Amino acid sequence: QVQLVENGGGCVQAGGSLRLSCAASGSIFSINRMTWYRQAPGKEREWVAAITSGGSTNYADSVKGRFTISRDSAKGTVYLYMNSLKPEDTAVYYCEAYGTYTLAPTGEGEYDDYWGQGTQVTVS
Amino acid sequence: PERRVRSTLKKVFGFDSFKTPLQESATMAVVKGNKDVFVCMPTGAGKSLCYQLPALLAKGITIVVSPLIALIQDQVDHLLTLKVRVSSLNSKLSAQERKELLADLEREKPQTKILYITPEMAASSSFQPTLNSLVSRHLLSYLVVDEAHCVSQWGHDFRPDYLRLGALRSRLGHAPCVALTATATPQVQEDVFAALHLKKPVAIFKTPCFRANLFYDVQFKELISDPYGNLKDFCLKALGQEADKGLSGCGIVYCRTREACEQLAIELSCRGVNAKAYHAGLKASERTLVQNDWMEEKVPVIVATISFGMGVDKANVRFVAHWNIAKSMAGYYQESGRAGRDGKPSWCRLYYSRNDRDQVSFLIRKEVAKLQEKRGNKASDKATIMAFDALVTFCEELGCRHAAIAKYFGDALPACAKGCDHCQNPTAVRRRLEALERSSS
Ligand SMILES: [Zn+2]
Fold first, then answer.
1. Which of A32, A99, A103 sits opposite B204 (nearest CB)?
2. B10, B36 in Cβ contact below 8 A?
3. How far apart are CA B336 and CA A114, in angstroms?
4. Taking the C-alpha atoms of B389, B392, B393 and B397 in order, what is their torsion angle to the nearest 10 degrees?
5. Is B184 in a helix, a strand, or coil?
6. Residues 6 or more apart from B71 whose CB is under 8 A from it?
7. Do β-strands B86-88 and B61-65 pair in parallel, antiparallel, or remain unpaired?
8. Which positions fall inside the Helicase C-terminal domain (chain B)?
9. Do B412 and A32 touch (CB under 8 A)?
């Protein structure tokens, strides 16, 4: 099994800036699509943005200019830079590990979805 | 517990233990049947048991789609020989025998335990209602799909009947699904999961391409003062593993063009490296004679264009050299693969020339345009180009060789144990690479 663990949220004022880390532990080989989802309590779960394994990426219209994800392809870990923050964006941030091909040298592996816990983001 | 499977293995299949401990793991996940499972194991007999034994202990009916009947009939004959209620639906057996089986399935508690169908039938409006009743009667225990790769245009044997097999899996929610193929690019595996509509988690059992004894290295024809001599030396290097043994073993050499193959045989032979040429340009009589000599080590070496055809893979194949790049990375795997079958140390070598690369580049380009006028632009057309580009990348880009093969194919990184050029001496690699930077033109 695999572990998706989030980091790097907290509180900040209107127009401020944070950077959010999503970390997949274990024997991964590749992940079709990694996606950031924000849970604003009192609102609809909202798709934020996502990066294909091949480096292609896509952002929600509301956060288009302000947010930007990236992979340290090596570190095996992806980031969301969230700048020009608004009160709107206050929420719990989690990632969806879609199409998570995991495998070992023994040959034994699994194709699965994995979800992360989330980290807490508050904006005046 | 697991004790169940152990007894049934020896009691029915007369086997003291599983051939491969990977097999054991694979079969157990199928027996649990919590999980859709996928098995890319090779022609080694292991894959069948991975749906055969579970089918018995299921207490329901185990369908197995298989694309050609050749393959089916082999097993069903052996299955019966082991006192098993198995039944094949092949157009091969009569329009009357067929009515008898359609019936058996329709009655509850049917005699058929395992139905080997063909894809063709499995799709047709003709077979659908008997299918429907099996599902509803929760009689279906496992839906097996052999040669799964057939579902993917990237796979050579694409069979669209197989695309309906996907909507079928969703209809049979209660019954788990087990797909199997000998080999599959992760590209293919990803198409499988999607077009076959498997349920995550899929448990995967894929034999790694990496092998311990094989020492892979790359040389560049642009950077050899005496190209034939290096080869002579390399053939001597791999052979004669024990000095006190003198000549030990045999080996192979590969050539895109017929003519060039012949040339090389003579070069080596003159040089003391006693070696014979072999291609489809020759009459068959020639070939079987030549092969004999090599097979008995009369002649410790052979040279075989892109057409040796795994006639036999011999125990003590100490080396495989490619004078030119092969047509596909896959190609290189298979070709090199023939080496070191006996598990004692062996050498694989590629001789890379930008000259070769561009030669094969316009070859494949012109014979692809030759099929585009014949058919049109197609998914698989681009794939042909790509399959070869991977081999060019394998030589041009520095990296542990067993891992580049594993990456293309979809194994995890292997344990090299100082067992390839990049792993043994990271630096001499850097040396000859930055060499080909200058010797690029
Ligand atoms: Zn290595």
1. A103
2. no
3. 38
4. -170
5. coil
6. B146, B147
7. unpaired
8. 230-392
9. no
- The answer to whether the peptide bond before residue B201 is cis (omega within 30 degrees of 0) is yes
Secondary structure tally for chain A: helices H, strands E: 0, 11
Q: Is B416 annotated as a binding residue?
A: yes
Query: What CATH number was assigned to the domain covering residues B214-439?
Result: 3.40.50.300
**Method of determination?**
X-ray
User: Structural domain boundaries of chain B?
Assistant: 2-206, 214-439
Task: Give the orientation angle of helix B21-32 with respect to helix B3-13, to 10 degrees.
Answer: 110
User: Is A104's Cβ below 8 Å from some Cβ in B?
Assistant: yes
Domain count within chain A:
1
> Which range of residues forms the domain containing residue A68?
3-123
The reply, when asked if residue B23 is annotated as ligand binding, is: yes
Does A111 lie at the interface with B, CB-CB under 8 angstroms? yes
> For residue B51, what are its two tokens?
């749906």
* Selection from B82, B70, B160 nearest residue B116 by Cα: B70
**Could A111 and B193 be called an inter-chain contact, meaning their C-beta atoms sit closer than 8 Å?**
yes
Helix (H) or strand (E) run with residue B197 in it: none
CB contact under 8 A, A99 and B190: yes
Q: Phi then psi for B63, rounded to 5 degrees?
A: -70, 145
CATH code of the domain occupying B2-206 = 3.40.50.300
**DSSP label at residue B297:** T
The SS3 assignment for B221 reads helix
Confirm or deny that B19 is annotated as ligand binding.
yes
Q: Kindly list the residues of chain B whose beta carbon comes within 8 Å of any beta carbon in chain A.
A: 22, 25, 38, 186, 189-190, 193, 198, 200-208, 410-415
Q: Does A113 touch chain B (CB under 8 A)?
A: yes
Three-state DSSP class for residue A101:
strand
